[PDB]
Design an enzyme around this catalytic site. Sequence first.
Site, PDB file in Angstrom:
ATOM      1  N   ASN A  59      37.062  88.132  25.409  1.00 24.24           N
ATOM      2  CA  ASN A  59      38.179  89.035  25.154  1.00 24.24           C
ATOM      3  C   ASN A  59      38.220  90.158  26.180  1.00 24.24           C
ATOM      4  OD1 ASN A  59      38.316  87.362  22.909  1.00 24.24           O
ATOM      5  ND2 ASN A  59      37.383  88.875  21.538  1.00 24.24           N
ATOM      6  N   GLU A 116      45.402  85.319   6.443  1.00 25.41           N
ATOM      7  CA  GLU A 116      44.165  85.365   5.679  1.00 25.41           C
ATOM      8  C   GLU A 116      43.629  86.787   5.667  1.00 25.41           C
ATOM      9  OE1 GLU A 116      44.976  83.358   8.084  1.00 25.41           O
ATOM     10  OE2 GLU A 116      44.256  81.309   7.780  1.00 25.41           O
ATOM     11  N   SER A 130      48.652  81.221  19.722  1.00 27.29           N
ATOM     12  CA  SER A 130      47.866  80.054  20.084  1.00 27.29           C
ATOM     13  C   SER A 130      48.621  78.808  19.649  1.00 27.29           C
ATOM     14  CB  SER A 130      46.472  80.089  19.442  1.00 27.29           C
ATOM     15  OG  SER A 130      46.542  79.834  18.051  1.00 27.29           O
ATOM     16  N   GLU A 153      61.885  91.807  37.029  1.00 27.61           N
ATOM     17  CA  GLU A 153      61.666  91.256  38.362  1.00 27.61           C
ATOM     18  C   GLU A 153      60.767  90.030  38.299  1.00 27.61           C
ATOM     19  OE1 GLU A 153      61.818  94.135  37.322  1.00 27.61           O
ATOM     20  OE2 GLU A 153      63.309  95.158  38.558  1.00 27.61           O
ATOM     21  N   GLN A 195      44.964  84.691  13.187  1.00 31.58           N
ATOM     22  CA  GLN A 195      43.666  85.355  13.216  1.00 31.58           C
ATOM     23  C   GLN A 195      42.909  85.062  14.501  1.00 31.58           C
ATOM     24  OE1 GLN A 195      40.785  83.300  13.048  1.00 31.58           O
ATOM     25  NE2 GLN A 195      42.024  81.439  12.843  1.00 31.58           N
ATOM     26  N   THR A 200      38.718  71.107  18.556  1.00 32.51           N
ATOM     27  CA  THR A 200      38.199  71.555  17.273  1.00 32.51           C
ATOM     28  C   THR A 200      39.043  71.070  16.105  1.00 32.51           C
ATOM     29  OG1 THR A 200      39.436  73.637  17.249  1.00 32.51           O
ATOM     30  CG2 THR A 200      37.336  73.605  18.429  1.00 32.51           C
ATOM     31  N   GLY A 258      46.115  77.633  13.467  1.00 29.47           N
ATOM     32  CA  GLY A 258      46.068  77.419  12.038  1.00 29.47           C
ATOM     33  C   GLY A 258      47.091  78.305  11.367  1.00 29.47           C
TER      34      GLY A 258
END
EC number: 3.6.5.-
Lengths: 48, 438, 427, 427, 105, 178, 32
Positions: free
Chosen positions: B228, B71, B140, B254, B11, B179, B144
């Site tokens: 973003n 989720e 990531s 390449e 997410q 975090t 999570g």
Amino acid sequence: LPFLPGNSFNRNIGKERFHKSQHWGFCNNVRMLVSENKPGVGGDLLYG
Amino acid sequence: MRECISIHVGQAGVQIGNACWELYCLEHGIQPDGQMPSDKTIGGGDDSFNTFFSETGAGKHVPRAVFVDLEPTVVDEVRTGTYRQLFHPEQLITGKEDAANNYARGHYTIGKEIVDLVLDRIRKLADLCTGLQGFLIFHSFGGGTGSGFASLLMERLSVDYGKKSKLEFAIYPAPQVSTAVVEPYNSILTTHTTLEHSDCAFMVDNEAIYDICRRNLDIERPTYTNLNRLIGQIVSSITASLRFDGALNVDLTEFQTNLVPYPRIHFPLATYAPVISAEKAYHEQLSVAEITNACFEPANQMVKCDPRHGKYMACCMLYRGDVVPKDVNAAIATIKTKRTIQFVDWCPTGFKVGINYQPPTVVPGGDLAKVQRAVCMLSNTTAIAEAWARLDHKFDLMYAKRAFVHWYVGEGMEEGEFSEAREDLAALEKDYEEVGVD
Amino acid sequence: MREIVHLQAGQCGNQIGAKFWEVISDEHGIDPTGTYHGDSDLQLERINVYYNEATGGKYVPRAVLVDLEPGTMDSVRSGPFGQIFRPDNFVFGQSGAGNNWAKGHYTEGAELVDSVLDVVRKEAESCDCLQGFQLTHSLGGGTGSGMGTLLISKIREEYPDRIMNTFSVVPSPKVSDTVVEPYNATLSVHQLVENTDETYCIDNEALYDICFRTLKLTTPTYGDLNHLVSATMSGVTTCLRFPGQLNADLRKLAVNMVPFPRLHFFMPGFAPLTSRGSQQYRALTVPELTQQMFDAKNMMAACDPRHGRYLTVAAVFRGRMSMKEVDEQMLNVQNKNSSYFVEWIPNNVKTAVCDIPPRGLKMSATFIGNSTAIQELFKRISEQFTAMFRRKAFLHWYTGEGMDEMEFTEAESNMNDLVSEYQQYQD
Amino acid sequence: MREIVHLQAGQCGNQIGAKFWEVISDEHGIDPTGTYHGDSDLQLERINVYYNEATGGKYVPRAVLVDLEPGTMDSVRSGPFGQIFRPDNFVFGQSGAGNNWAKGHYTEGAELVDSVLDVVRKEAESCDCLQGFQLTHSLGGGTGSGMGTLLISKIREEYPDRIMNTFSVVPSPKVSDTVVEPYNATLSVHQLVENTDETYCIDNEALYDICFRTLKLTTPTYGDLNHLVSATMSGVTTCLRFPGQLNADLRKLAVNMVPFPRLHFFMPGFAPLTSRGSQQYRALTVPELTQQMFDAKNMMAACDPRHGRYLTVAAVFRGRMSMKEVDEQMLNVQNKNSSYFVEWIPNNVKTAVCDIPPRGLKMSATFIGNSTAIQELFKRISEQFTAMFRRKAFLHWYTGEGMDEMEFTEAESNMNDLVSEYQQYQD
Amino acid sequence: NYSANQYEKAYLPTYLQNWSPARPTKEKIAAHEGYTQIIANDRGHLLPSVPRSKASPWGIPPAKVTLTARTTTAADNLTKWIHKNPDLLNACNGLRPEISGKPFD
Amino acid sequence: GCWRELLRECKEKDTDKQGTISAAEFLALVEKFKLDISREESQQLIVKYDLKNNGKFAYCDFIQSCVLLLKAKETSLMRRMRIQNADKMKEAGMETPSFYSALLRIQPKIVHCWRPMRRSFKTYDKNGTGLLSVADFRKVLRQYSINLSEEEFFHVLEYYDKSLSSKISYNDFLRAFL
Amino acid sequence: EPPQHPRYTSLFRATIKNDMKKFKTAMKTMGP
Ligand SMILES: Nc1nc2c(ncn2[C@@H]2O[C@H](COP(=O)(O)OP(=O)(O)OP(=O)(O)O)[C@@H](O)[C@H]2O)c(=O)[nH]1
Ligand SMILES: Nc1nc2c(ncn2[C@@H]2O[C@H](COP(=O)(O)OP(=O)(O)OP(=O)(O)O)[C@@H](O)[C@H]2O)c(=O)[nH]1
Ligand SMILES: Nc1nc2c(ncn2[C@@H]2O[C@H](COP(=O)(O)OP(=O)(O)OP(=O)(O)O)[C@@H](O)[C@H]2O)c(=O)[nH]1
């Protein structure tokens, strides 16, 4: 002016549309040019 | 032909993917409905979208990406967004249970019964596509759900499909911001699992994204939308070679063949020079020379690394917009004469130039500048080992007192896998040192 | 009668030929559609050297385009003279190069060489008797090296009695863009020296310098770089197509040009390059032509043999000249430049004159040179391999393709030879 | 045929050639645009001595401009006749000099001597047979001293067979503005006496006094000073370009001028200089011409030879004169001061008469003198060098460039040797 | 990292505006015989036998002055006052100034 | 003349195969030409080469072992070092430069133009894969002015072959002199 | 065995061989 070297002056004015198409392709299992009607760089008309 | 597939796991990795697709529709003028104006670009799915969207005789541009999450909260929200009619419902894979930041929970507990459904999606996307140069993996490390679920799928897609590329994009862990204290656990777990399969992994850090936000963009309070927006521009720039032509055209093959010197390490760093505020662009001038210095200015790199502490191996610049061969070749010659730039002596040549005529445009309601001359700077240097070296002492201390292990051994692992990753990492630093030893 | 069939290889050659072929059509006065506008009888008569006939006065070019990337051939098809090019002659592949020499030499080449050989032999059977073939590509070109080295080998046994003209561009010595670009070169030149008989060597840095030196126009197009090399390669072909008391055959030329078999690499030379004011600030006379013909700046190939010495020189003069000005200027350049040449061979000057001037200028010329200035080239080429093959950077790919380190070793040993050969013969 | 190629050196010569060449263009009647207006034939045949042919009846000057400060050339290029000068001939550097001789002789000239040598040999080969070269520069002029001393050292070995004319202006004795000016002078003269065959000596203070004397116009332009002197070299060159029973070759003159090799320094002399009212208060007669021609006030070069005696004298007469009047006037002056000559040589007069008068005046003459009046010149500087080399003021710069005092020690006694020489022969 | 040939005017600090000379260069080489073997395994790992620059690089009072004529004792100190600073003599853009002068009597 | 003169030095002496040259009279060659060999080394040589083929000093090995013989590889391209292992391993006629005196004759020819003969072998469509027909090897030899006699042929057959015809690989031949 | 005819030096070796080399100012002229 003729087409002599150094006399080639490109149309370098505002050129905002630059889209490209795929004039050729493969299809099935042989290779050919995909449907003739194709715009050019930024929607260019073909020859005639 | 020339097309690829994007994957957004976690997410965390989904909203960035939406922004990328949100970006993509603008330069193509895609209406949110899914159809063009009365203008003629529809057909059997063959135009600028044919590499990105699938606008068949049905007339709806279908993005070539699959969104996977564990989720239902955020994933349904985009399904209630503005472009949800564009998206394929069960391409937007949801989940009902989370991995709770546990790599293995997403890797073992739920991942088994979902990948098969996902494997159905890719093959039904594999059959329809033709060129399939590679994949766009957005994930990531401290996921999570991004971390664990990506690891299993990349393994499965590697074994069945090993004749094509795969491009990985993950937020790099914040060097001084955490975090989650378990985030390092799975991060090293992810790295050791991916070292023997991954082709090209690109990392990014949000702190420096925020750092540049108020430095030149002068926003003391940006948002993810801006965050973003920046990364969506970054992937947009690299896809311009796909989406446009230029003076010369280059492809991911390449890139991979030329960016990575030797196996294992495939970890380059991205940088985009013309990042400036609108007004600062307004009364100033842009050309290749200064943007080349800025992209080579050490504080403009998005990762917390000092190039003066390291040495360069790879360098890649993608010039998108109005440029000429004369200044750039003269300009890059200046850097070859530069003394601070310490490339490794093994490579007299370490530069990869891509020229694209198209000037990058602005997004309505956006915050970027008016870019005519652009360059995305992809490079690989030896100054990267500090981040992993930061992780290991961070990792080793908590492993020494085996914090939170009772969760992981509680739900089905042991120390052996945690043991292996460390000498895999310990191999990296000494290898990173040995390669740094010219 | 004797004809030449052309091969378009690598993406540079795609840009090279497009400019080269439009030059020929516009020089001969054929419209972009193809309906020749009858204006010169001599170009009407000697069109058969390079073109065949289609219905309704259409002069089909006898060239072959080969590539892998459709966008390049899509672009040139949309280019000013893609219409005069044949989808029959548009042969290409379903694969991406990776700028990989081995893939285009062992993997991708295998399934395309069959068709391209069919295309050329169909073209070969279409025509009567060829002088030989000319080849546009790059030695540092990623796939052009891949295809050509394969094709030249196959043509060698196919027609070992013809002229294997090769036109390749030397990449920039200071700046290479591609990092495996050197590796591709030695891989190619190893077979090239075995297979080629002629080789033109051209570099872009001089081209930038010449545009700097005489074009004056700061920002050119790479097509202009194509536009000037197309003029140069056209000049050597003016001999064949045009009348005048000059013997035109490349074999005529090569036997006077090649003293020993290993000599294949040659440097060009061209005639008036003029600046904005100097068009009316120049007294167009053979002496000042001869001065400009032999200028350390007028060269474009690699560099001045100022470092070395002169082996063989051949100059072709296109326009209304006479045997005496060339003779006395040759005597002038002889007495002025005598011992710089190797005492091995005196009077190694080779002169031809084309009485037919070009369309736009009258007193014109072209020069082809083989001097002792190629040492620095493969000397330059020598170090980086010893530098990068020292530590086999970027090598796991080629081993994955099935290649071995050993193949490089004969290739470098072959060039280690030619360094001494160029050295020992001159020094 | 025998021709001459000119050299522009130093920023003083930047004024000169512009003024020098425009007089010639006006003399020969070429418009500022460059299209010759046929009015006199003799100038039409005998323009090739200095000019080459450009297209459209344009006569390209054969002169070479070199400097360092761009602003000078742009003003010259924007001058009334900058168009007739060639951008090819415009060679210059990417540096300011700092008016430092060593930098202009060792540092900056390093990368420019190559280019200027190519340009001149391009011009040298553009012409058939030169008498030699003439140079406009200064001995006290920084960049000119640095450049000229380099090239004169060079242009000797390539062409040790030609006339190496040097035209240098001596700075003001009372003040030199530049304080390192003598340091520039001593270095330059040391090579100059070794390399040159001719040297003109010119001073501005005399020009200032002449304005007070006959010009009487209070405030002139320095261009007028250039325009005055340009007449002087014009007259000595009127011999070559014009017919009339006078033998013109500077070598023909120089052998009559130079008794011993180290005699390079000569003083000029010019003809009628007329004040506000005396134009029609003057009866233009060879006596009063000869009177004014031999006047200590009419002297303009360095100082009065009244202090010393006369070694050699030569006056060229331009206009409708004859064998007689120049004879008894020579007899008159010979009887006038017979003892002021040197008993070493009698009849040291050398006469030439140009029958073609200038455009603007009919009776005219040009005198060149070699007397014993140069002692005061290098005596004056001699104390300066002893005073300022006494404790090496401002010397850290030259050691920074790489200079050392041994070069000063070697140069100084060369001049001192000439002091004894110039003293010994006459005294 | 070599210097080019012939046209040796198109690449200079004249355009770079460089105020610390870039790097010494050259155009020369002894003809290198050698099979150019590989002494790495997969990483640039030197085979323990072959030697390298063994961990040499791994990863204010100095000024341009001419001694000219300033009292020797001061001049003697200045030379020492220039040197003995490897932190500004060795690497990292070059770090080494120049010097000149002449002695006393 | 580390190759030529030292060869000629022995060619002055004349005896039969096994009786190569008396160690005492080879010391007479030492006085005929002072040798770079140290005095202690000089003493072993007369007794480290008299052990084979009579008390006569074995120039048979010595002369060729010093310069002609190099049965190993190199770091520095001994003019080619192609990789190859065909004819040397078998070698029924093990190295015997007295029996194989042709090696003494042919090195002059190969030091002249080793590279063209190195080129010459592959020009015969060898495919760069190994060996090449013996009769083809015979014709390449004489054609480049390398005249080799039938008795010399029989020897090199024993040396560069053990069992049957075989096809004597190029570098496998080359590295003997190379 | 045919003896090679003694190459008759009707000058040549003396003159025309040295005359070719003597009227030569090369190794000098375009530039060092
Ligand atoms: N890729 C990405 N990362 C983000 C974003 N916003 C914050 N992050 C960082 O990325 C991390 C998200 O990782 P996870 O929490 O494990 O995400 P997940 O595996 O999908 O599962 P969740 O716990 O539901 O989020 C956070 O720790 C943030 O520091 C974002 O928009 N995109
Ligand atoms: N067409 C083209 N080629 C260029 C240009 N500038 C440099 N080149 C080089 O010229 C070479 C020749 O192109 P090709 O022979 O078609 O190359 P290829 O084998 O198809 O594969 P690549 O070299 O990787 O592109 C290329 O490799 C380029 O590196 C240019 O402006 N246009
Ligand atoms: N052009 C010009 N030069 C002048 C004028 N007045 C005096 N001069 C002198 O002419 C001298 C010669 O000029 P150059 O030889 O070109 O001098 P330089 O090498 O550029 O260096 P400097 O002598 O320091 O100016 C100068 O030193 C000036 O002192 C003038 O009005 N115009």
